[PDB]
Ligand SMILES: *[C@@H]1O[C@H](CO)[C@@H](O[C@@H]2O[C@H](CO)[C@@H](O)[C@H](O)[C@H]2NC(C)=O)[C@H](O)[C@H]1NC(C)=O
Ligand SMILES: *[C@@H]1O[C@H](CO)[C@@H](O[C@@H]2O[C@H](CO)[C@@H](O)[C@H](O)[C@H]2NC(C)=O)[C@H](O)[C@H]1NC(C)=O
Ligand SMILES: *[C@@H]1O[C@H](CO)[C@@H](O[C@@H]2O[C@H](CO)[C@@H](O)[C@H](O)[C@H]2NC(C)=O)[C@H](O)[C@H]1NC(C)=O
Ligand SMILES: *[C@@H]1O[C@H](CO)[C@@H](O[C@@H]2O[C@H](CO)[C@@H](O)[C@H](O)[C@H]2NC(C)=O)[C@H](O)[C@H]1NC(C)=O
Ligand SMILES: *[C@@H]1O[C@H](CO)[C@@H](O[C@@H]2O[C@H](CO)[C@@H](O)[C@H](O)[C@H]2NC(C)=O)[C@H](O)[C@H]1NC(C)=O
Ligand SMILES: *[C@@H]1O[C@H](CO)[C@@H](O)[C@H](O)[C@H]1NC(C)=O
Ligand SMILES: *[C@@H]1O[C@H](CO)[C@@H](O)[C@H](O)[C@H]1NC(C)=O
Ligand SMILES: *[C@@H]1O[C@H](CO)[C@@H](O)[C@H](O)[C@H]1NC(C)=O
């Protein structure tokens with residue numbers, strides 16, 4: 001990296017470069033600034049309404065809440081110590097704060113401990129088959145607590 | 147504008163030079179694409 | 195007449211090329227092929243190859259290293275395979291183009307810089323000359339060729355008999371319009387009186403098949419008599 | 421039998437047409453095979469009769485058309501099938517639909533296969549025909565007759581030849597891992613592929629100049 | 631060799647034969663299927679072009695006259711035999727008799743009967759008109775006088791031919807008889823063609839056999855996997871099978887591309903020989919048989935051409 005002749009020597013793996021023109025590196029301009037633009041919303045998503053609901057629905061008649069037109073601070077969820085299972089597919093929890101989505105569906109229900117494993121992509125069993133099925137290409141998070 | 151920048155519009159990330167465009171986007175059209183199915187033009191989320 | 199025919203022919207080339215584009219198919223084809231191979235290559239970027247997305251920044255911005263690694267490995271495999279395909283196709287196509295270019299060089303040497311005696315190598319005809327003309331990603335040869343046009347039947351014979359000797363033509367053929375025999379060059383009807391300057395003698399008349407009788411004129415005898 | 425069916429015999433599945441065979445299995449042999457390890461015959465487990473498996477008829481479907489600049493009327497070729505499975509004409513190439521069969525032979529316009537070409541001709545329609553190799557001619561050969569030209573012509577013919585291609589280059593790194601470090605670091609695990617592809621393309625471009 | 635077998639392969643049916651899960655996975659690979667089809671179609675069109683370039687070198691279809699007075703030369707063994715169903719000559723019959731899952735074989739655009747007609751036309755032209763039918767209008771000339779020209783073409787005076795006509799004709803007839811004997815006796819003569827055939831045969835056997843492979847999947851059969859595993863795992867197994875079979879198809883297509891390049895080179899050479907050798911008299915040494923070239927006679931053959939080079 002000292003000088004272009006040295007880049008050439010390193011590319012050819014030799015000390016004795018013969019006359020010619022050699023393609024050595026690739027020039028690429030580096031970005032000067034970081035630009036972040038999001039729509040100017042000030043509205044927390046009503047996650048309390050869903051997680052702090054007094055009574056929940058049965059798995060066969062699982063409730064579905066639509067989330068739209070709001071700012072979702074997912075830290076409030078993934079930094080809480082109240083959840084035993086926080087398993088995110090096709091997304092990493094930390095990254096959620098940095099992402100936008102057209103819609104979010106919060107499907108809430110209650111099951112027993114041993115069936116929690118069935119709420120995951122491509123699972124089998126009573127729940128995954130007859131109650132609530134996730135797609136094989138599911139992109140989201142599953143949160144469960146005792 | 148007119149600088150090589152690391153931009154993020156609504157999660158759409160990339161690196162490029164942003165310039166005033168002359169494309170006749172329709173009132174509904176959100177961003178545009180090139181023959182290569184790559185993002186070629188955007189609508190600022192804060193400004194139409 | 196020859197100059198007029200040549201000018202007319204070049205005019206016809208002008209008209210043909212001005213009118214119909216299809217003439218340059220061999221070139222257009224090449225172009226199209228490479229175009230397709232590139233469109234294909236570029237389109238193969240929009241494919242998932244089993245990953246969660248075909249875009250790399252989306253994966254990088256959505257997953258943690260341990261999982262983005264797997265998704266990017268899928269994409270890398272796919273795109274590297276696509277590049278290898280394109281490069282292999284291009285190597286084979288370049289071999290074909292090299293063959294065409296070697297042929298074009300051989301034509302420019304043997305055809306333009308010379309006069310070729312090889313049949314159909316320098317246009318259908320007897321080759322006279324050829325003129326090169328550049329073109330996008332190729333060359334164009336105008337081959338000027340001599341094509342015999344109006345033909346006549348004649349009775350012929352492989353030799354004749356004068357004094358029990360057999361006369362064969364030196365360069366040409368013996369022909370007959372029905373009454374008199376002549377000898378003419380074989381590519382254009384220019385009959386000449388058969389003489390000893392036009393023929394040579396070999397053996398006698400009892401060997402050749404299809405030999406005929408005629409008189410061979412000796413140019414010396416008139417001069418001696420005069 | 422004699423229908424395209426999805427069959428399942430004791431272990432094996434497939435799709436084909438089952439027909440009465442004339443094969444002679446040994447009393448213990450269950451299902452027959454081709455040279456290419458392809459199942460060609462079975463034994464029905466309930467009745468000890470042998471069935472040939474013919475794969476369900478398939479093939480390319482080709483569309484014959486003059487230019488849209490000329491006409492919107494087209495013909496269809498179902499390749500290497502019968503006219504049963506689908507103005508219809510059976511040919512060595514397959515089933516041709518929408519083209520008129522003609523006894524007259526012409527120069528080949530649109531090749532179909534096995535000596536059949538098609539074209540758009542006069543009320544105009546598409547026609548198929550056995551293609552004509554050229555005007556048949558006999559030459560007045562005899563042991564004592566020669567034809568000599570008395571005149572001539574100067575022809576100028578055009579011969580076009582491709583010489584060079586487009587000197588394309590691809591940065592394998594930027595193509596695979598566009599402006600990404602994680603991706604590039606993963607790409608490093610594949611060894612010399614990037615360099616080898618660059619080298620091949622550079623070879624091609626230098627060859628083009630040569 | 632002039633042409634290959636115009637093979638075509640349906641990538642979809644080859645990889646994912648009549649299977650929806652497999653096909654839906656295959657969609658993720660993009661245009662590989664289309665580009666393989668396109669490459670093979672290129673090859674097949676090239677094959678038709680090869681045959682055209684070699685044999686369709688004559689505008690008119692000449693036929694010989696009923697009288698076979700060719701100054702004592704005998705061409706019965708190479709002119710077409712009217713009695714046979716296919717209008718082929720004795721030697722063409724010998725040559726034709728000396729050669730033996732989504733995959734379709736497209737038929738060639740010219741039938742054996744048309745190839746034989748083209749060769750018959752070339753042969754009749756070369757016999758009745760010499761080299762003039764390559765230049766332009768065919769001009770009759772007695773065959774003996776044609777041979778006198780062909781002798782003048784190699785620096786032997788024409789009297790030699792006329793004075794030794796019976797002897798030369800007898801030598802030529804003897805030589806053609808020897809050709810008959812060689813082809814009836816030894817098959818190895820047609821190796822260059824048989825080889826081609828065998829190669830393509832092998833490339834297809836191989837392709838088909840690659841279906842019986844697992845490529846690291848639980849099974850080589852697709853329905854077994856679909857009927858045995860759950861979707862989340864059947865997808866992985868089918869991806870293994872798809873990768874394997876797609877690689878096998880790419881291998882086969884690449885080999886076919888290279889082999890078609892080889893066949894095209896051979897066909898360009900054959901076309902050059904038919905032009906410079908049949909339609910003319912070549913002065914290039916050893917291009918038209920070992921000797922001083924006198925003339926040459928073409929003869930069709932399975933996927934190729936055969937030249938009888940007459941040399942002094
Ligand atoms: C064959 O050619 C000869 C020579 O050209 C012709 O004989 C000449 O005929 C013209 C008139 O037609 C006379 O004026 C000359 O006196 C003749 N020349 C000689 C040397 O006798 C002959 O007529 C031609 N025959 C045919 C059938 O065309
Ligand atoms: C060509 O000319 C020679 C000489 O005039 C002919 O030979 C004569 O043939 C006749 C017929 O048999 C005999 O009567 C003579 O005795 C022969 N003369 C000599 C000197 O041998 C010959 O016949 C002529 N060709 C033709 C076809 O008539
Ligand atoms: C399977 O079962 C069927 C019926 O029990 C058998 O078919 C019978 O075969 C006998 C002997 O040829 C016939 O007389 C009967 O008419 C058949 N009955 C029917 C209903 O088809 C068959 O042979 C058995 N095969 C095996 C391998 O056990
Ligand atoms: C050779 O052919 C050329 C062209 O076919 C002839 O030239 C033509 O002559 C006729 C009548 O004299 C004219 O109507 C044309 O305009 C001429 N064409 C050209 C291009 O000049 C010529 O007459 C022929 N020569 C012989 C001896 O027949
Ligand atoms: C040209 O050669 C052929 C082949 O030798 C000759 O055909 C033979 O002719 C004899 C006599 O009629 C027959 O007995 C044979 O059966 C023929 N051979 C075959 C293989 O059929 C023919 O005679 C020769 N032509 C001439 C004019 O001599
Ligand atoms: C739900 O309730 C808990 C405890 O009452 C609280 O800590 C949490 O912030 C609530 N969730 C919201 C407000 O989204
Ligand atoms: C918010 O966005 C809207 C978009 O229509 C715009 O009119 C408004 O000026 C913005 N306000 C702020 C404070 O960004
Ligand atoms: C020569 O004569 C034959 C018949 O004798 C005839 O068919 C042919 O057309 C003639 N050729 C020319 C050039 O006149």
Ligand SMILES: *[C@@H]1O[C@H](CO)[C@@H](O)[C@H](O)[C@H]1NC(C)=O
Nearest residue numbers: 403404405562563564697699
């Ligand atoms: C030429 O042919 C005729 C008619 O077949 C025949 O009578 C004559 O003997 C032959 N002559 C020669 C020299 O070939």
Ligand SMILES: *[C@@H]1O[C@H](CO)[C@@H](O)[C@H](O)[C@H]1NC(C)=O
Nearest residue numbers: 213214215487488489490491
């Ligand atoms: C259709 O063909 C004619 C000649 O046959 C040509 O003049 C015309 O340009 C073509 N149409 C178009 C739209 O190019």
Ligand SMILES: *[C@@H]1O[C@H](CO)[C@@H](O)[C@H](O)[C@H]1NC(C)=O
Nearest residue numbers: 501502503504505510511512
């Ligand atoms: C088409 O079908 C009929 C009856 O099924 C049959 O006789 C005929 O041979 C078939 N044609 C071909 C080319 O197989």
Ligand SMILES: *[C@@H]1O[C@H](CO)[C@@H](O)[C@H](O)[C@H]1NC(C)=O
Nearest residue numbers: 520521522523524525549550
């Ligand atoms: C075409 O040929 C076939 C078979 O020879 C015959 O049945 C038919 O009548 C012919 N058609 C015409 C219009 O001559």
